[PDB]
Structure 1
Amino acid sequence: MRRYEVNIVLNPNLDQSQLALEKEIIQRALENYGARVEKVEELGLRRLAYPIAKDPQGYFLWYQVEMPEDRVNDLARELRIRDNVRRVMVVKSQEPFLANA
């Protein structure tokens, strides 16, 4: 069971309740699928470089997680049945290759 990065872009028009409702709906799914959570980074509001679902912006989640490889598809499948879930992009974690010094 390996280490991944879950990206979620959320609807940018949510009050603390609808917003943190989604999040707990997410933490739920995540647990339910086998994912313990290393680091996190809620960067929330960012201005999209092109309109996603008609909206000039999007709300950015970012978990780092370990989970069972065979569930990773099945999680992100589910993770995105929501409407305020606009992108799910789950990526195998990676040594940070660099340039310049």
Structure 2
Amino acid sequence: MRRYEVNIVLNPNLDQSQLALEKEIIQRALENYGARVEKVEELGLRRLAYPIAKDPQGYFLWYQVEMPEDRVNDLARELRIRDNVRRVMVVKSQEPFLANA
């Protein structure tokens, strides 16, 4: 059981219901691939350096989770199934490494 970080960038265009629906499907996802959520950051609408899906912006979440490694990929596969989801990036959590310290 390892710590990862799940990055999800979805539609700038979602209103309250559609978005809290997406978030709901994400919860259900994580939960049914066996992930416990340690902390979360919803940074929301933010300004992309290049256009993704013809939209210049994206809605950013990040979730730091503990899950079984063996299912990690399938989880992402699931997260990606959704239409409104245009980026998924899962990382194995790494301890912060800082220059100038």
- TM-score where L is the length of structure 1: 0.98
Alpha-carbon separation, structure 2, partners of 1:79 and 1:10: 11
- TM-score where L is the length of structure 2: 0.98
Alpha-carbon separation, structure 2, partners of 1:97 and 1:56: 31
Deviations 1:50-79 (CA, angstroms, capped at 9, x unpaired): 000000100001000000000000100111
Query: How much does 1:83 deviate?
Result: 0.8
Query: Structure 1 unaligned runs (5+)?
Result: none
Alpha-carbon separation, structure 1, partners of 2:45 and 2:72: 26
Displaced runs of 4 or more, over 4 A = none
Alpha-carbon separation, structure 2, partners of 1:9 and 1:61: 7
Counting aligned pairs with the same residue, the percent is: 100
Structure with greater strand share of residues: 2
What is the aligned-residue RMSD (CA, Å)? 0.5
